[PDB]
């Protein structure tokens with residue numbers, strides 16, 4: 635009967651979409667367990683195995699500016715908020731699988747894109763020809779699930795276990811933004827022609843893929859100071875990749891070229907209009923209680939519009 639509790643401010647604000655998990659690394663495991671316990675149940679996982687899993691997941695994130703352990707927990711918290719706001723829509727295995735998938739979705743990221751691994755000719759690019767880093771993240775997740783004392787799913791049947799690992803695999807693969815565009819277009823058509831059916835497994839898969847994009851991008855749904863300071867970590871990676879491209883004798887795209895900092899504000903506008911706003915719009919159409927994500931995203935677009943107008 636060992637409940638996790640949070641100080642009052644965190645207990646109230648963790649329920650909101652725009653919650654920031656804060657700078658105290660040591661509180662992030664407890665924040666995650668708190669979320670598993672309320673979204674899934676105190677009965678979902680054996681506490682000792684869950685803690686051991688969380689700490690090995692953490693040890694397998696690297697000290698990179700953006701694709702780090704803080705990002706993992708942040709993406710899990712956005713999934714927690716979606717799940718808590720859409721209580722009755724998700725199966726017991728989905729609740730179990732999706733927080734784990736979010737915690738694991740960038741395991742062992744090096745701060746480089748799929749594109750950079752292909753141009754560098756990294757061994758992973760020969761092992762996994764598409765969604766290269768995402769196939770790796772899922773491979774690291776199965777490794778950790780198979781360490782002694784780390785099987786958090788040990789009470790599921792063979793077939794339930796296979797179903798949860800299949801939810802996790804698909805959820806992690808869906809965080810490849812290259813796959814997002816086509817997934818969102820199909821969901822838009824299905825919703826607008828009324829063919830969307832949440833009893834159809836291949837439809838559920840698409841909706842979970844869209845949820846994973848929404849959680850992965852959730853920096854654009856925070857309070858503006860969080861959004862703006864997170865953008866600094868995102869560019870610190872992209873600019874390092876740009877430098878590594880210049881070392882291979884390749885002009886990087888402007889997004890990755892630190893010499894073109896001036897173009898960031900306009901680049902953020904394209905990103906909100908082409909990626910983020912379409913993401914949270916379709917999500918809000920399918921799952922109305924996720925509207926606060928769309929509202930926060932549009933508020934951050936206006937802040938980037940002010941940066942261009944020289945008002946910030």
Ligand SMILES: Cc1c(Cl)cc(Cl)c2nc(CCc3nc4cc(Cl)ccc4s3)nn12
Nearest residue numbers: 851852853854888889894897898901902905
């Ligand atoms: C906020 C955010 C999240 Cl949450 C996730 C991802 Cl993947 C992401 N990518 C970007 C970069 C968007 C872009 N910047 C630039 C900069 C220039 Cl000079 C030229 C073109 C572009 S296009 N922002 N971003």
Ligand SMILES: [Mg+2]
Nearest residue numbers: 739740767809
């Ligand atoms: Mg990723």
Ligand SMILES: [Zn+2]
Nearest residue numbers: 739740809850
């Ligand atoms: Zn991510």
